Amino acid sequence: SMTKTWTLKKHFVGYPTNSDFELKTSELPPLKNGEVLLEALFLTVDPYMRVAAKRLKEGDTMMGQQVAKVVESKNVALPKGTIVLASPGWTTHSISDGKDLEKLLTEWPDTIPLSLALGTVGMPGLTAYFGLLEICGVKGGETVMVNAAAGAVGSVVGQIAKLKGCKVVGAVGSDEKVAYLQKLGFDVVFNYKTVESLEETLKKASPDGYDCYFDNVGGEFSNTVIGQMKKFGRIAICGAISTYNRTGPLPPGPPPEIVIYQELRMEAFVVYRWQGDARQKALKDLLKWVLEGKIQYKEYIIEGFENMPAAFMGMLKGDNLGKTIVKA
C-alpha cells in the first residue's frame, strides 16, 4: 500500500510558488487491530493553511481535511466503503485508529456532492453561520457589508443574511463574481479592483452606513469600511486574507478617532469554538437550507491530487468562485 503526500519543501515568501511544495511517494505499514486505510476522494485547500504553514518544519506534511472512503478495515465501527471526514493533511492514502474521524450527517442525501462536507455543510459554512448570526448578531433589517463575498464563507454569509431579511453589500475581485452574486440576489455587489473609489462606492451602496461587517479581508479595505460603520456597529473579524501573503509590515491600522466615536465592537473568532449540539444544529440548518434552495452552492473543482498546490495558490490569488475543492 502506497501513498502520495504533499510536503512543504520551503516556507513561503509572499505567495507560495510550486518549488515550495514537494510531492513524496511513501509506503504505509499494515493495519493493526482497530485501524483503517483511508482513500482520499475530495480534499480542501483553505486560506488558514497559508498561516498554519508558518508553524511547520521544512519536510512536514501540509495540513488539511478531506472526504475519505475506508478501503481496508480492522475496525467494526468502520466497515469498507464508509465515507468519513478526516484530517491527515495533503495525502492520498492514510491510516487511522478511528478516534479522529467524523461520519457525515445521517440525513445526508445522495443528491448533493460529498464535497459540500468541506464547504457549505462544513467548516466554511459553520464559519459563516456563527460569524454572522452570533458574532455580528444579525437580527433582521440590518445592512451587512461582506467582502470575499463570492468565496466559500462570504457567499454563505450573504445568503444567510438575505434569508434573514438583511440588505447585503458584497465586494469581490472579478466581474464574473459580481454577476454571479447579483443573480443570487445580493442587493449591491461591486468589484473592488475596478471601482474608482472604494469609499465612494461603499457610500453609494449604503448612504446610511453599515450595521454589520463580516470581514474576511482586513488591511486597507477594512480601514475604509470602518469609516462607514454606523454607531455601535459590529465587526466580525473572521479573516484578514489581504495580509496572509503580504511581504512587508502590515498596512496602517484603522483611524482611532473613528473607531472610538462610532463606538465599534470588533470580535475575532475561530469556527472550532462551536462544538457539540450548537455545531450539530448549525450543520442541520445549513443542510436544510441547501435542500430548500435558500442557499445555493457552487464549487470550484480542480482535478488531480498532483494539482493540489496549484489549487491552493489560485484560491489565495482569487481564481475560485465558491469553495475550492481538489478531486482525487
Ligand X SMILES: NC(=O)c1ccc[n+]([C@@H]2O[C@H](COP(=O)([O-])OP(=O)(O)OC[C@H]3O[C@@H](n4cnc5c(N)ncnc54)[C@H](OP(=O)(O)O)[C@@H]3O)[C@@H](O)[C@H]2O)c1
Ligand Y SMILES: O=C(c1ccc(OCCN2CCCCC2)cc1)c1c(-c2ccc(O)cc2)sc2cc(O)ccc12
Site string for ligand X, 70-99 (x = CB under 6 A): ------------------------------
Closest of 275, 274, 276, 321 to residue 301, by C-alpha: 321
Q: Looking at beta carbons only, is 14 or 276 nearer to ligand Y?
A: 276
239 labelled ligand-binding: yes
Helix (H, G, I), strand (E, B) or coil at 326: strand
Helix (H, G, I), strand (E, B) or coil at 158: helix
Site string for ligand Y, 92-111 (x = CB under 6 A): --------------------
Binding of ligand Y by 32 (CB under 6 A): no
User: In this structure, what C-alpha cell is assigned to residue 318?
Assistant: 482569487
User: Nearest-5° angle of CA 97, CA 101, CA 105?
Assistant: 145
The region of 91-99, 108-116, 141-149, 268-276 touching ligand Y under the rule CB under 6 A is 268-276
DSSP letter string, 248-284? SSPPP---HHHHHHTT-EEEE--GGG--HHHHHHHHH
CB 15 within 8 A of CB 316: yes
The region of 2-10, 91-99, 196-204, 233-241 touching ligand X under the rule CB under 6 A is 233-241
Neighbours of 20 (CB within 10 A): 18
15 labelled ligand-binding: no
Could you say which of Cl ion, ligand Y, ligand X, none residue 82 binds, taking C-beta under 5 to 8 angstroms by partner kind? Answer: none
Closest of 75, 96, 1, 72 to residue 33, by C-alpha: 75
169 labelled ligand-binding: no
Binding of ligand Y by 250 (CB under 6 A): no
Binding residue for ligand X (CB under 6 A) from 64, 113, 151, 233?
151
* Burial of 243: CB neighbours in 10 Å, binned 0-12, 13-18, 19+: middle
- HSE (CB half, 13 Å, CA atoms) of 175? 2
CB 187 within 8 A of CB 171: no
301 labelled ligand-binding: no
Site string for ligand X, 168-207 (x = CB under 6 A): ----xxx--x------------------------------
Binding residue for ligand X (CB under 6 A) from 21, 158, 320, 328?
320
Positions touching ligand X (CB under 6 A) are 46-48, 124, 127, 148, 150-154, 172-174, 177, 216-217, 238-239, 241-242, 269-271, 315-316, 318, 320, 324
Binding-site sequence positions: 151-154, 177, 192, 216, 238-244, 269-271, 320
Interface with ligand Y (CB under 6 A): 47-48, 51-52, 55, 87, 239, 270, 272-273
